[PDB]
């Protein structure tokens, strides 16, 4: 078997030009309902696993160009619950660019306070890809429909985070429809679900775009605005209200908690409400207000359930052709600080899953690296002469791209870019 190769100098330049990064991705609700006995309360919304990136295709072509069927180059993958002794349900990624596990569930046997979705992955010809995980997920025995104190967060949605809202008709898992967007409007496809920003707007808010949001958690009554975390299109000013027994209340200052059925009040008009007509999202009114001037009974299909979704992400590249070892784990870089400067210019990185078999690349230049720990690394900023055969001191600001490169070739595109600034 061809021994691993050090990503050659020329190899980098090639990537920097193309940059067809193969990137996995995952989306899931930060919380999950634990099923007791032999029950089975699936994960809603269903954990999706997109496979964005142009490199994904370039891999298909490269694989077949060496003898691979439409089946031997088709990326396969399973999904499971951390270190649980259950079976990793498979995924059907044929033709599709994603895939949701509409049947993932956790039993009460797993006495874990937390856990995280495990996604085994490999190509058609058993070519190992790696194991991609998702952020942690808290286990709840039941959504505290009772009051919520702003002391125990994590269960309280905050202005800015992402969330998901679905609908359950007549108590049937086959009906469940999630709030989605496509074509330019807000659907309700029970096949797809999307994360929607939930900014908090002060009662004295204007019309729409170019507005201002303010930090803080969200309690029923506040004028919140839901923006599509992808397309961008959002629904006009809305006011969330705590609901129960098909009745949308107007007097509820309680803080919105995870898994809490609630109705959304449109703009400052008379009544109306956001409801799902078993097809798409259309306007309504919910005029019945006989009970109390503060208890406006609302027609079903408008009592969406709240949930805060997260998002895991991993991007890499086969900078030096296939590799005997998996591209997992994936080194992520969150912080990049400069230590000192000049003759001793050094860089300290901090992220996750860092490995001792890594090296940082300043553009097309490989700089010495020191492995601190799983989330810290020290490299040496190469002299500017390594980018300007003519100078010995920064004559002009030169911005080179940063990137992590393993020893077998696999390169992990960061996003950060170190820039050489003239020493004052």
């Amino acid at each position: 078997r061809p021994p691993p190769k050090r990503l050659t100098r020329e190899a980098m330049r090639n990537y920097l030009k193309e940059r067809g990064d193969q990137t996995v991705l995952i989306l899931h609700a930060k919380v999950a309902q634990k099923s007791y006995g032999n029950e089975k309360r699936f994960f809603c919304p269903p954990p999706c696993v997109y496979l964005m990136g142009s490199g994904w295709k370039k891999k298909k072509e490269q694989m077949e160009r060496d003898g691979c069927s439409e089946q031997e180059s088709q990326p396969c993958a399973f999904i499971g619950i951390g270190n649980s002794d259950q079976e990793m349900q498979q995924l059907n990624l044929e033709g599709k660019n994603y895939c949701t596990a509409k049947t993932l569930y956790i039993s009460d046997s797993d006495k874990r306070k937390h856990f995280m979705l495990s996604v085994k992955m490999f190509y058609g010809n058993s070519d190992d890809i790696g194991v991609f995980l998702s952020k942690r997920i808290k286990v709840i025995s039941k959504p505290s429909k009772k009051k919520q104190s702003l002391k125990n967060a994590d269960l309280c949605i905050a202005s800015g985070t992402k969330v998901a809202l679905f609908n359950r008709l007549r108590s049937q898992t086959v009906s469940t429809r999630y709030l989605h967007v496509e074509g330019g409007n807000f659907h309700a496809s029970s096949q797809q679900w999307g994360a929607f920003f939930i900014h908090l707007l002060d009662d004295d808010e204007s019309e729409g775009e170019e507005f201002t949001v303010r930090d803080g958690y969200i309690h029923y009554g506040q004028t919140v605005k839901l923006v599509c975390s992808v397309t961008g299109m959002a629904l006009p000013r809305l006011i969330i209200r705590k609901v129960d027994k098909q009745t949308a209340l107007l007097d509820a200052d309680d803080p919105v908690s995870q898994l809490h059925k609630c109705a959304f009040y449109l703009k400052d008009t008379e009544r109306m409400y956001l409801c799902l007509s078993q097809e798409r999202i259309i306007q309504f009114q919910a005029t019945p207000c006989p009970k109390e001037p503060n208890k406006e009974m609302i027609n079903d299909g408008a009592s969406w359930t709240i949930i805060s979704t997260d998002k895991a992400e991993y991007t890499f590249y086969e900078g030096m052709g296939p590799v005997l070892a998996p591209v997992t784990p994936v080194p992520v870089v969150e912080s990049l600080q400069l230590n000192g400067g000049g003759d001793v210019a050094m860089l300290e990185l901090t992220g996750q899953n860092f490995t001792p078999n890594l090296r940082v690349w300043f553009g097309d230049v490989e700089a010495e690296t020191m492995y601190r720990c799983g989330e810290s690394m020290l490299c040496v900023v190469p002299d500017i002469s390594a980018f300007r055969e003519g100078w010995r001191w920064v004559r002009q600001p030169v911005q080179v791209p940063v990137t992590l490169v393993r020893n077998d070739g696999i390169i992990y595109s960061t996003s950060l870019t170190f820039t050489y600034t003239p020493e004052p």
């Binding site: 019309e207 605005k225 923006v227 959002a234 400052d268 259309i282 306007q283």
Partner: peptide, 19 residues
């Protein structure tokens, strides 16, 4: 309160209602 998130509005049915 110092930040600012832009977007793209979209109204289903009965938009003039808000007046």
């Amino acid at each position: 309160k110092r930040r600012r998130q832009h977007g793209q509005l979209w109204f289903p049915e009965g938009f003039k209602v808000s007046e």
